[PDB]
Design a protein around this ligand. Structure first.
Ligand SMILES: Nc1nc2c(ncn2[C@@H]2O[C@H](COP(=O)(O)OP(=O)(O)O[C@H]3O[C@H](C(=O)O)[C@@H](O)[C@H](O)[C@@H]3O)[C@@H](O)[C@H]2O)c(=O)[nH]1
Ligand SMILES: Nc1nc2c(ncn2[C@@H]2O[C@H](COP(=O)(O)OP(=O)(O)O[C@H]3O[C@H](C(=O)O)[C@@H](O)[C@H](O)[C@@H]3O)[C@@H](O)[C@H]2O)c(=O)[nH]1
Lengths: 436, 436
């Protein structure tokens, strides 16, 4: 197909060439006549391994060209890939300036041409951008309507600089955000030949996706730095430490621990986090990320409390009490924290937990349950249907498989608050998730 | 093997059972008489899938028993595993009360004992605990010297409650902290049949290994929760978002981005960290972790500074300028920032980077290099030898392989400051690493 590409920076030029070398008619579009002159000369504006070669191949076959003429580029192509920059404003919000101009330029170019055009955003933008800005802009400028007259979708890239090409060739995944089915299919052909999954989501979800990947990346670099700093301070090598950790593909580098949900608890995570940062503090090793964990963890408890507590009623049924399903361990259980908050603030609380139950007559914790936390434990009710019937707000606190059935057999008159993720879908006025 | 286990809690009881199911002789020991008794009836003190059944089998083959007679346990076994809990003190630090107690008794036991007894610590303890607490208390109480007379070693655990047994039978890996080969071999013979890599390291490293793993899990949950919160405030399901993130094993769930070293930079990571948090703020969504990345990131740059400016010499050579090797992209390069700080402090700064040097000749970002950051670029030097020779302190800022030679065979009279990880080993008087 014939592709126009708006913005010829690191991702735009890489695109220009990668597509042009696969059999596409590619028109590189940029505001600066230096980048374009370089392109027509078949030369790379950047130092990127193997880019020049690709670009020179684009001119030799006549499959690639550049022009500063936006309108033409549109009228001469069937698909436009938006790759212009979105730099930071002085307050952190991203500057949409460039994106807007391109959008206008495109809309104006469509007002003319009668055939359908396809506008795919690749530039990283906050969620809601395509819907609240690029669409209405194009529309208001083309006098047309997104979806019906012209296609719109988003297409995040994950190219790294200095390996943009190989990243292009072998991506982790290909993700597509679609308004119209038609625009989605076009992208599907485009990456059809790539040995990686294709993931079709709504425009917004896609926008969130690319942002999360990037912040996760900084999160990782940050972790390794803070850990390495503590390492040096205590005499060992961070590199050696992080290597071993990167060996674990069951916990450290899997999807485990990555489900958005409730605070973490137990008799290990919170103490070790406290134990290592205290030590870091003794060695004069600052550590803002490591040192914000607990703070965040508590926020999450508070959050559940604010959700549960917002329905004009004291009647709460708390399903799950141990720090996690399948164990009776109550040590630093966020659910007890939660329970204790509700009690301290006067709520009519009723609790269900068959494991904590079994333990009240079958363990080495009897003492603790009847003398250490009687104000919590005496609120335990073993009849699950009783807890549901006499509560107004039902709170799914842990992964007990028994709570699924509950999630699909919920009676009228009850609010659900989901903290682990049993809900098949997103919040409604009757059922709310802490992160959905 | 005859194995004694001190601390019949969640970790110790599981160990007792699994070990004994594997044909060893196990003496469970704990301070609580009520614990020992449930163990002698083959009953489980805790609610943990399949533990009871293991404990009864342990009894029924006479391969597993229990007592409070510490001395007897050490006297009738060749190796002990220390599994006593380590609780938090009001200040976050670790309470070695229980560990110490169990160390004293053992020492007293191995004294009266002629043959080599082997001590393994499974309890999670800070780096250096074993060298400065366990060994000394046992040496003292036993009159014997750690290493030659009795074996010592560290051996963390990654079992997760509720899947403890599965986790024991199928671990991510086995980590051995060894002092004397003898104990290291002993542990390996035990875990030989486990389908996982065995990792042998110095005590201090394994101690730091286990900790890093726990705080890393706590960070994953933390990242995931804070992302889901923002996800939900922006209208989408944080779960749909986190599933996709977890579908990427090249960048997201891989070892990339996990090398301790220098702050991140470039025109994407920092810009995106700032944008998301900015949005997060607009929406009243607290995010202590996400929101601390930049301070921490910026605290790494300053860290590199302090390293460099501590050598009583104004002559500094910065090898690498662009945000990474393989590109000339200068946007928000931490190396540039480093340079500007060094400049503002009046250092004789010389800079090598073959990519930018090339870029300021071919490419499109020459204006920036020439007219926007002249005060950095005129400190450029084309010849790497010229920079190395005329500087007293060399900085390895990015991973350009050209710098490998400099570190393998370094001209005397130079101080090395390794920001990326070229050094084969730890810090010395001539070559200092940022996280090693
Ligand atoms: N929000 C959220 N929370 C999670 C997720 N996965 C687990 N959690 C929670 O994180 C906390 C820790 O649970 P987990 O690590 O499964 O169990 P446990 O704490 O018993 O085991 C951990 O400590 C052991 C230990 O140090 O003794 C470790 O060995 C072990 O590997 C774990 O790190 C729990 O409160 C969990 O609910 C998730 O995807 N999302
Ligand atoms: N300390 C440390 N720093 C690292 C490591 N790995 C990478 N870095 C740094 O993290 C920063 C980003 O590098 P990288 O992600 O490899 O390059 P780039 O930032 O150009 O690509 C990223 O931005 C693209 C984008 O959003 O446009 C993404 O698409 C892409 O996937 C990356 O996130 C750099 O400053 C790196 O130095 C590490 O293990 N340790």
């Amino acid at each position: 197909m014939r592709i126009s590409i708006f913005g010829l920076g690191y991702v735009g030029a890489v695109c220009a060439g990668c597509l042009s070398a696969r059999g596409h008619e590619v028109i590189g579009v940029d505001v600066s006549s230096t980048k374009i002159d370089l392109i027509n000369q078949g030369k790379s504006p950047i130092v990127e391994p193997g880019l020049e070669a690709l670009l020179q191949q684009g001119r030799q076959t006549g499959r690639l060209s550049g022009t500063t003429d936006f309108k033409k580029a549109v009228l001469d192509s069937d698909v436009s890939f938006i790759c212009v920059g979105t730099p930071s404003k002085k307050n952190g919000d991203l500057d949409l300036g460039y994106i807007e101009t391109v959008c206008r330029e495109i809309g104006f170019a469509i007002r003319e041409k009668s055939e359908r055009h396809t506008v795919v955003v690749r530039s990283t933008v906050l969620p809601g951008t395509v819907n609240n800005v690029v669409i209405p802009l194009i529309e208001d400028c083309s006098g047309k309507k997104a979806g019906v007259d012209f296609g719109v979708g988003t297409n995040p890239e994950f190219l790294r600089e200095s390996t943009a090409i190989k990243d292009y060739d072998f991506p982790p995944m290909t993700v597509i955000g679609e308004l119209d089915k038609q625009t989605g299919d076009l992208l599907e052909e485009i990456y059809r030949e790539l040995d990686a999954p294709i993931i079709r989501k709504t425009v917004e979800v896609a926008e969130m996706i690319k942002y999360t990947c990037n912040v996760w990346h900084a999160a990782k670099v940050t972790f390794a730095n803070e850990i390495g700093n503590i390492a040096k301070a205590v005499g060992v090598d961070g590199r050696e430490v992080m290597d071993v950790i990167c060996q674990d593909h069951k916990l450290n580098l899997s999807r485990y621990y990555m489900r958005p949900g409730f605070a973490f608890g137990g008799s290990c995570l919170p103490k070790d986090v406290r134990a290592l940062t205290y030590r870091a503090s003794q060695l004069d090793v600052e550590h803002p990320m490591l040192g914000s964990l607990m703070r965040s963890n508590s926020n999450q408890v508070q959050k559940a409390f604010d959700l549960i507590t917002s329905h004009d009623t004291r009647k709460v049924g708390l399903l799950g009490l141990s720090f996690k399903a399948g164990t009776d361990d109550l040590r630093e259980s966020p659910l007890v924290e939660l329970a204790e908050m509700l009690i301290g603030k006067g709520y009519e609380l009723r609790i269900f937990d068959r494991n904590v139950e079994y333990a009240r007559v079958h363990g080495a914790n009897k003492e603790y349950i009847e003398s250490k936390i009687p104000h919590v434990s005496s609120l335990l009710v073993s009849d699950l249907d009783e807890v549901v019937a006499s509560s107004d707000v039902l709170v799914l606190g842990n992964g007990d498989e028994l709570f699924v059935d509950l999630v699909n057999k919920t009676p009228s008159g009850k609010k659900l608050v989901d903290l682990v993720g049993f809900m098949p879908h997103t919040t409604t006025a009757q059922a709310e998730g802490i992160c959905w």
